[PDB]
Amino acid sequence: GSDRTEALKRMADALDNYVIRGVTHNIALLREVIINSRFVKGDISTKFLSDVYPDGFKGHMLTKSEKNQLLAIASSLFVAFQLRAQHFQEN
């Protein structure tokens, strides 16, 4: 991108639109590191990951608003399948 924020935002978007299924991949780790406040500011050392994840990688941690969005999306998608299940060709 033209600047540091544009390239990072575009990377975040590419990772969420990148479909890998059949194996275990490391997208969750890449998606969280690039959005880390130290990475965006640039306070990165060669041992960065060892201090951020001293007990291992745990996955993306949700905040209050993100949990509400995840619950709303999962609930709306659940209902969308329940409604599709009722649309038959008329007998």
Binding site: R84, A85, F88
Partner: protein, 507 residues
């Protein structure tokens, strides 16, 4: 006391059934009541209860006592809808005389059986019974006979589904044998004629309740139950999903539902599934999941006769049945157990106008005295018969092996098939190169040199295709597109057959 007060008092008792203390025990054991199960199964508010005020008329052995007068007489019957589609249900209530069958009990079930046949709607039974009610004696035996007569009459007319939600003993254990699918609940449901008490008394054998007739036995070893589910809530959730596959009656075409999965997409993942080396197995399920709409597949008997895969799926919205081999198990060979499961599935789908898709990869039959003495010949004829007599669209794709008589058993084109596709890895022959060449050139010199020439000419799908056995040889990635095209034009197919009172299956 007014009549309205008496009516209200009967309504309250009918809802409690066997009483609150029994209901409390019902939950302690981890079971739902008969009415709670229906509320989960059917669309909210759609259920209408029939004959809620019927009571038994037996007066002998103290049955005339007020303490025995349970409105509903141990069954909840009525009608409703699942996703807007009409279905009839009944559920046996274990808290009232142990769920035992009375004369009036059967009568109510028969009533539902008759309305469903007349209109053309499926019947779903939730069975849980301790057997015949001995206080009435022979009245309950007539009850079973009348139910059996309806279950036979309804065969091929309306789907019949039986979900077992508890123990089942005596004559009751035969109704799931007449219906089309039997499902169970793990560690909760049982199917047996006599209990362990009789086995110990008759013969010197030691067995417990789970070993004799538990859900794990019937879904893994005897081949009686089509699938067991972990608990009551999950069992009914999957039952609603299963229901959505089937037509309401055999007079109806396979249901077609809204579908977002483009019918003309390719599946590149198929081109490399089948190894070039003949001794390397692969998972047939990977092919099935990639072809079917949105990768949804409903597998039947996942733990029984694993060498053959049968189940339900949709393609372009239309329900289809899928049958295929599993090369991972017993090299993909046919045996007694696989023929029984296959023939039963094929026949149901034909009766209710559900197209068949066949994925062939079968090297022959399982050899050995275990199968010879078991009647492998008599049993293999069941699958050949089920395909040969089918009148619904049949689309066969051969993914790799098809040796010997198994070629024709697995729905070959000459059994009135509609289309037959081969992948480039398919090989159709009476037997493999080793057997065929050593037999043809028996006692000759330089057999291995002759084998090299034989393999180059015959170890491929071409000597069959050039004779009209195969309609095309397709890149595997296009399989879904080809099948979708055939299904949407064979759906209007009609054929005639000579009249016969009934079919005569080899048994």
């Amino acid at each position: 006391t007014s009549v309205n007060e008496r009516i209200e008092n009967k309504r309250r008792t009918a809802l409690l059934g066997g009483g609150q203390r029994r209901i409390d025990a019902q939950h302690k054991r981890g079971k739902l009541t008969a009415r709670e199960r229906i509320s989960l199964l059917l669309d909210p508010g759609s259920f209408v209860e029939s004959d809620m005020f019927v009571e038994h008329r037996c007066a002998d052995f103290g049955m005339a006592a007020d303490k025995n007068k349970f409105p509903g007489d141990s069954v909840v019957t009525g009608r409703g809808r699942i996703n807007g589609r009409l279905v009839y249900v009944f559920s046996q209530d274990f808290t009232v005389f142990g769920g035992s069958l009375s004369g009036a009990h059967a009568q109510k079930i028969c009533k539902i059986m008759d309305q469903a046949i007349t209109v053309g709607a499926p019947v779903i039974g939730l069975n849980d019974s301790g057997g015949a009610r001995i206080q009435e004696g022979v009245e309950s035996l007539a009850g079973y006979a009348d139910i059996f007569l309806r279950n036979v009459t309804a065969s091929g007319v309306i789907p019949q589904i039986s979900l077992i939600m508890g123990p089942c003993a005596g004559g009751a254990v035969y109704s799931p044998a007449l219906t089309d699918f039997t499902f169970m609940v793990k560690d909760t449901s049982y199917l047996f004629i006599t209990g362990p008490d009789v086995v110990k008394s008759v013969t010197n054998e030691d067995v417990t309740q789970e070993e004799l007739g538990g859900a794990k036995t019937h879904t893994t070893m005897s081949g009686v139950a089509h699938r067991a589910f972990e608990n009551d809530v999950d069992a009914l959730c999957n039952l609603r999903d299963f229901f959505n596959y089937l037509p309401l009656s055999s007079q109806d075409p396979a249901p077609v539902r809204e579908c977002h999965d483009p019918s003309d997409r390719l599946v590149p993942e198929l081109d490399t599934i089948v190894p070039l080396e003949s001794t390397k197995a692969y998972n047939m399920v990977d092919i099935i999941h990639s072809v079917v709409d949105e990768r949804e597949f409903f597998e039947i008997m996942p733990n029984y006769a694993k060498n053959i895969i049968v189940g339900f799926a949709r393609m372009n919205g239309r329900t289809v049945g899928i049958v295929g081999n599993q090369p991972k198990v017993a090299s993909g060979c046919l045996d007694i157990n696989s023929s029984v499961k296959g023939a039963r599935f094929v026949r149901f789908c034909d009766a209710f106008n559900i197209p068949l898709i066949t994925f062939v990869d079968v090297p022959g039959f399982l050899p050995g005295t275990a199968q010879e003495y078991g009647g492998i010949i008599r049993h293999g004829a069941k699958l050949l018969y089920a395909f040969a007599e089918a009148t619904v669209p049949k689309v066969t794709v051969i993914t790799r092996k098809a040796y010997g008589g198994a070629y024709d058993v697995m729905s070959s084109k000459h059994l009135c098939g509609d289309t037959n596709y081969a992948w480039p890895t398919a090989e159709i022959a009476v037997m493999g190169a080793k057997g065929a060449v050593e037999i043809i050139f028996k006692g000759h010199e330089n057999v291995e040199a002759a084998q090299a020439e034989y393999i180059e000419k015959f170890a491929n799908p071409f000597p069959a295709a050039v004779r009209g056995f195969v309609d095309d040889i397709i890149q595997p990635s296009s399989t879904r597109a080809r099948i979708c095209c055939d299904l949407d034009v064979l759906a209007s197919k009609k054929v005639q057959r000579p009249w016969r009172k009934h079919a005569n299956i080899p048994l």
